[PDB]
Amino acid sequence: TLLPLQTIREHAKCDDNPRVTDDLLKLYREAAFEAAELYTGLSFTPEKTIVEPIRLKGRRGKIILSATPIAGRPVVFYGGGLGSPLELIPRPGSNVL
Amino acid sequence: TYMKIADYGQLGEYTCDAKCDAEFGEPGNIRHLEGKTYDYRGVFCFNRKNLQ
């Protein structure tokens, strides 16, 4: 739904002459789509939810989230000397909190 | 007038980690009191001669 095969055969100048079958193009399209996701950092697959114990770093507690939540959903912390859970609305674009 | 401590009351107990439920507890009363006194008020009479 994001990118149809007809756009491939029209941009890559293979509409008339195939030069490749369809399932190989399907494998190619998955390959090109599994490469940009991890190169740019921006998550993919419609949303995800990570449970992740955070480790303290620094005297004031610099905390980087390994998955950079969306823009403003309050991240919850608990356990490890933290008596009561509390929310935290993070940075959009960066994960340094 | 005197005073009577009705009870003492509890104070928030033994939380290892913050759950914020028993903050202030509940104390007791002091119950000011009062009280009066009473009296007898009796009499009697003889005339002059049956006593003499």
Tell me what the structure shows:
The structure is cut from a larger assembly and holds chains A (97 residues) and B (52 residues). With 97 residues, chain A is of the alpha+beta class. In chain A, 27% of the residues lie in helices and 8% in strands. Chain A has two helices and two strands; from the N terminus they run ααββ. Chain A has a two-stranded antiparallel ribbon. The radius of gyration of chain A is 21 Å and the shape is rod-shaped. Chain A starts with a helix and ends in an 11-residue tail after the last strand. Chain B has 52 residues and is largely without helices or strands. The radius of gyration of chain B is 30 Å and the shape is rod-shaped. Helices cover 0% and strands 8% of the residues of chain B. Chain B has a two-stranded antiparallel ribbon with strand order 1-2. Chain B has strands at residues 9-10, 26-27. Classes of the chains: A alpha+beta (97), B little secondary structure (52). Chain A binds chain B through residues 82-84, and chain B through 16-20.
Question: How does the SSE layout of this entry go?
Answer:
The structure is cut from a larger assembly and holds chains A (97 residues) and B (52 residues).
Chain A: H1 5-11, H2 22-40, E1 77-79, E2 82-86
Antiparallel strand pairs in A: 1-2
Chain B: E1 9-10, E2 26-27
Antiparallel strand pairs in B: 1-2
How would you sum up this structure in a few lines?
It is classed as virus. With 97 residues, chain A is of the alpha+beta class. Chain A has helices spanning 5-11, 22-40, and strands spanning 77-79, 82-86.
Which labels suit this protein?
part of a larger assembly, 2 chains, A: 97 residues, alpha+beta, two-stranded antiparallel sheet, 8% strand, rod-shaped, B: 52 residues, little secondary structure, Major capsid protein (chain B), Head-to-tail connector complex protein (chain A)
Based on DSSP secondary structure assignment, what is the total number of beta strands of chain B?
2
Task: Count all strands of chain A and give the number.
Answer: 2
Largest sheet of chain B: 2 strands, antiparallel
Q: Most extensive interface, residues per chain? A: A-B, 3 and 5 residues
Strand order of the largest sheet of chain B: 1-2
Strand content of the residues of chain B, in percent?
Answer: 5-15%
Query: Radius of gyration of chain A over alpha carbons?
Result: 21 Å
- As a percent range, the share of strand residues of chain A is 5-15%
PDB class: virus
Keywords: Myophage, redox trigger, virus
Entry title: Structure of neck with portal vertex of capsid of Agrobacterium phage Milano
Chain A: Neck 1 protein, gp14
